[PDB]
RNA sequence: ACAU
DNA sequence: CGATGT
């Protein structure tokens, strides 16, 4: 309904998908970069979103912070909801440092809590999210 | 269909 | 146009 301005907003980018993924995270209020992912070689814009959120919500933890995160991924919320991503990309030598961060993150999740509520962004009202790469 |  | 996902 309406926008919470005082949040983390974060996205994907790629080259390619599957592709050279990276991500970031943002204040959605001014817009400030607060991190960024090194590419990564070959991965998937759902992994890639995962990987954003979780990456989120170590930030925040690591920070006393109760802000919110806001993802554009209905499959990358889903899947830190369930902790478990449900990525389709074949497991190979190619892939390996993608799967490793995410297996990692999988991880993280499951000896870890948090509160921080995961919302949809409502791109169809708002636009693109705050942390987009503006390259569609 | 919806979301990327 | 095509790929990733529920
Ligand atoms: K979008
Ligand atoms: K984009
Ligand atoms: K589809
Ligand atoms: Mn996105
Ligand atoms: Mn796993
Ligand atoms: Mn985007
Ligand atoms: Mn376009
Ligand atoms: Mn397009």
């Not at 590419?39 to 954003?52: D, K, V, Y």
């Not at 979780?54 to 806001?70: A, F, Q, T």
């Not at 991503?85 to 993280?108: G, P, Q």
């Given at each position: ?53 979780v990456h989120g919500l170590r930030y925040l933890k690591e920070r006393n912070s109760r802000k919110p995160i ?67």
């Amino acid at each position: 309904e309406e926008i919470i301005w005082e949040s983390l907003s974060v996205d994907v980018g790629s080259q390619g998908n599957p592709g050279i993924v990276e991500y970031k995270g943002v204040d959605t209020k001014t817009g400030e970069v607060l991190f960024e992912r090194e590419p990564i070689p070959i991965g998937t814009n759902n992994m890639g979103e995962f990987l954003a959120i979780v990456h989120g919500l170590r930030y925040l933890k690591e920070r006393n912070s109760r802000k919110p995160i806001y993802s554009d991924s209905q499959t990358a919320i889903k899947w830190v909801k369930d902790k478990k991503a449900k990525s389709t990309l074949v497991r190979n030598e190619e892939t390996a440092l993608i799967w490793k961060l995410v297996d990692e993150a999988e991880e993280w999740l499951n000896t870890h809590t948090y509160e921080t509520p995961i919302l949809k962004w409502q791109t169809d009202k708002w636009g693109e999210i705050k942390a987009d790469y503006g390259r569609k």
